[PDB]
């Protein structure tokens, strides 16, 4: 909720969109170190509000990880797989195989989850919890 500079405060979380080129592995790697995680869509509002900050052309990595077509859809954050909230793009062929990580892509003029090889580089969203309250002496040291 309280976050540095341009982190979009929403509810209790903060979401920062990046248009740089990173793999899902590197985006998870560059995130988390900031106390944040990749864009983990907890609510349909998380989605519908973040796509207002996202550019209608880039594809932004989400925190949904599967690591071998295991069926282990988990958000790298804490958020479990939302059974009521699965926003697939469509019956999308793409190229997804092996490791599969969903991104928010604007295609067919619709924002939706598109799962792509996590070794692919694309844009990303980083989400940090309102942990700034805990970072009082923490960041005072750091």
Swiss-Prot record:
A GO term, aspect molecular function: metal ion binding
Keywords in alphabetical order: Adaptive immunity, Calcium, Cell membrane, Disulfide bond, Glycoprotein, Immunity, Innate immunity, Lectin, Membrane, Metal-binding, Signal-anchor, Transmembrane, Transmembrane helix
GO CC annotations, alphabetized: external side of plasma membrane; ficolin-1-rich granule membrane; plasma membrane; specific granule membrane; tertiary granule membrane
Membrane topology: Single-pass type II membrane protein
Residues carrying sugar: 21, 30
Induction: By autocrine inflammatory stimuli.
Domain C-type lectin intervals: 10-127
Cell compartment(s), UniProt: Cell membrane
Protein name per UniProt: C-type lectin domain family 4 member D
Species in which this protein is naturally found: Homo sapiens (Human)
Lineage, uppermost ranks: Eukaryota, Metazoa, Chordata, Craniata, Vertebrata
Full protein segment contained here: 84 to 215 of 215
């Amino acid at each position: 909720m309280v976050c540095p500079i341009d982190w979009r405060a929403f509810q209790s979380n903060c979401y920062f969109p990046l248009t740089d080129n990173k793999t899902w592995a590197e985006s998870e790697r560059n995130c988390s170190g900031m106390g944040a995680h990749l864009m983990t869509i907890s609510t349909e509002a998380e989605q519908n509000f973040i796509i207002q900050f996202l550019d209608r052309r880039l594809s932004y990595f989400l925190g949904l990880r599967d690591e071998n077509a295991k069926g282990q859809w988990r958000w790298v954050d804490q958020t479990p797989f939302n059974p009521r909230r699965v926003f697939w793009h469509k019956n999308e062929p793409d190229n997804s195989q092996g490791e599969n990580c969903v991104v928010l892509v604007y295609n067919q003029d619709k924002w939706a989850w598109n799962d792509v090889p996590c070794n692919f580089e694309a844009s990303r969203i980083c989400k940090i919890p309102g942990t700034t309250l805990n970072a009082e002496n923490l960041y005072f040291q750091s």
